[PDB]
Every structure is written in structure tokens, then in C-alpha cells.
């Protein structure tokens, strides 16, 4: 049953300082905003995902990006803790700057960068995160993540 | 390493995915797996000394994450006492399209895997997200090079539990 995780919206800061934000918009879709980090400023609406419940309070959000980045987030909701593996093509660990946009406006651009690569070797980032903020926005709220990070109010 | 991983390191287990594929993993140490694919698209494939990221996410919830010389990336969440596993696998297009090219003792064909990797095509990624039942599960201790030391076909009589 995914009802537990669908609509969950949270900000979470990885052990390496990166402040990420997810809204699980439905059983197969997240929005996300990166506030801090390698790719701070980057955000994404309607990222197609695999979401599954691995046990009671252990959800997994799995996806591949137009950049070629693959991601598997284990989200432990009640425990307010998260683990992300990020499989960055070499060209995003090297030159992440073009990926820092509203991606939905630059999908063919991202795939063009993706295709020339270099894809290999992959740069894997495995980090725990503390979930600092967490709320239920319900399904299909396009207003949860509808701006870049810096365009949020100073208390968010 | 603090005690968090001691409940997963040394764990050797065979498991069958929702889609029928029998996989086998031995967590050989805090940063290394061996694995043996009995069945599936990549049945017969096996791997020694795969660099891996293991972490404990909760009690009985381990996460094991790696990228291969093929460009395949994997994150398996392992729930050991519940005898259940989940794997996401990020297959370069050329592995979903020509998985045979990857069905070997990879250690003896690493450059071949990287040549296929480099040749591509890498994209689009074929994401495979499946639950699996862990059907056999034992502790083989750390750094045992014997537990996965042959292909599935050269295993002994009744090695499937």
C-alpha cells in the first residue's frame, strides 16, 4: 500500500551538507527541488519514478533522469531519516551546471548532454539525510513544488 | 565500522524475483559483494569482488548499491529476517538489448564488459524494480573467497536449497 507515502512532502539534508526536497505527487511521480549542493538550484516536476513500500515505514523511490542520473532513495518517514544512492554519469559529477535549471524546460538539452557523456565511470553518492521538515500535501498538488529553491520564502 | 553492518556482512543468500529470476549474493565485507545469477535475462552471469556501498537503513533493512563495469547500476534494499529483498537495476540499453554479452564470469571479461559499455548504447536506461523472496540465507563470515568461486552450472549437487 503506497497511500502512506503518496502526498508526502519533505526537506532533508544529506550527511555531506546538500539540502534536497521531494514531494511524492502520486504512486509513479515526484517533484523535487535541490536547495544546496553539487546541483543546488536544480528542480524537477513530474519525475517518473518507481515507488514501493519495502516494509511499514521504509519506502523506496527509484528513477532515471534525462541527465542519465539514476537514483534510489530509501525514505524512512516516521524515523524522519532518508538514504539516497545517486548514480551520476561522469559528465554530471564533472560538469553539473547545465543540469541546474528547471529541467522540464530543457529535457532535449539534458538528453543531448546525456548522450555525448562521458557517462563512465559513474560517480556514486551514498548519503543518509535527516528529514528536517515533513508534511502531507495529498496527491497531485502541482503547487507543492512549482518554483526554484531561491524563489521560496525565507522561512520554508 | 560500528556494529550496524555485522548483521549483513557475511550473509550469503539466494533469492527469486517476482519475475522468476533466481539471484545469489554473498556480502563478502562492508564494501564488497560476490553475486551469481542462476536464471533470468542474465542467468549464468556472476561476479567476484564487486565494489559496493552497504549501509543499515533500520533493524533488518540493509541497502547495497553499486555500478558495474557494464554501466549497470543497482540498489538492493535487503530485509534479511523477513527473507525479502527489493532490487532496482539501472540497465544501460545495451544490457537490456544484449544481456548475453554480460552472461559470463565478468572477472575474466571485464575489458569486454567495458568495451560493450563504451560501444553503448547506454541510453535509454531500462529500470527493473522487483521484490524477491530470499529462499536460502546463511552466514558465511567475512572475506570467504569460496562462497561464490564458480559459475552456477559448475556448482555441486543440490546447491539450490
Numbering used by the authors:
A (entry chain A): 8 to 163
B (entry chain B): 5 to 165
Relevant lines from the article:
Enzymatic decarboxylation of biobased hydroxycinnamic acids gives access to phenolic styrenes for adhesive production. To date, several PADs have been biochemically analyzed and structurally characterized. PADs adopt the lipocalin fold, and the core of the protein is formed by two mutually perpendicular β-sheets. In solution, a homodimer is formed by two monomers that are related by an improper 2-fold axis. In this study, we used ancestral sequence reconstruction to generate thermostable decarboxylases.
The relatively recent ancestor N31 has a significantly higher thermostability (Tm = 78.1 °C) than proteins from more distant clades, such as N2 (Tm = 56.1 °C) or N4 (Tm = 55.2 °C). Notably, although N31 did not evolve from thermophilic bacteria, it has a much higher thermostability and can perform decarboxylation reactions at temperatures exceeding 60 °C. We also aimed to improve the thermostability of N31 further using the publicly available PoPMuSiC server. To gain a better understanding based on their activity and stability, we determined the structures of N31, N55, and N134 via X-ray crystallography. The models for the remaining ancestors were predicted using AlphaFold 2.41 N31, N55, and N134 were crystallized with one, two, and three homodimers in the asymmetric unit at a resolution of 3.1, 1.6, and 2.5 Å, respectively. The ancestral PAD N31 showed high activity in DES/water mixtures and maintained activity in the presence of 70% (v/v) DES/buffer and at 60 °C, while BsPAD can perform decarboxylation in 50% (v/v) DES/buffer and at 30 °C. This allows applications in homogeneous solutions, which is beneficial, among others, for continuous flow setups. The specific activity of N31 increased notably from 30 to 60 °C, while BsPAD immediately precipitated at 60 °C. Thus, N31 bears all of the features of a thermostable enzyme. In contrast, N31 shows a specific activity of 50 U/mg at 60 °C, a temperature where the half-life time exceeds days. N31 retained its stability for more than 3 days, while under the same conditions, BsPAD rapidly lost its activity, preventing reliable half-life time determination. In addition to the half-life time, the thermal stability of the enzyme also increased in DES. Both N31 and BsPAD exhibited an ∼6 °C increased unfolding temperature in 70% (v/v) DES/buffer as determined by circular dichroism spectroscopy. N31 is a phenolic acid decarboxylase with unparalleled thermostability, allowing it to work under conditions of higher temperature and thus much better substrate solubility, which is a critical factor for the space-time yield of a biocatalytic process.
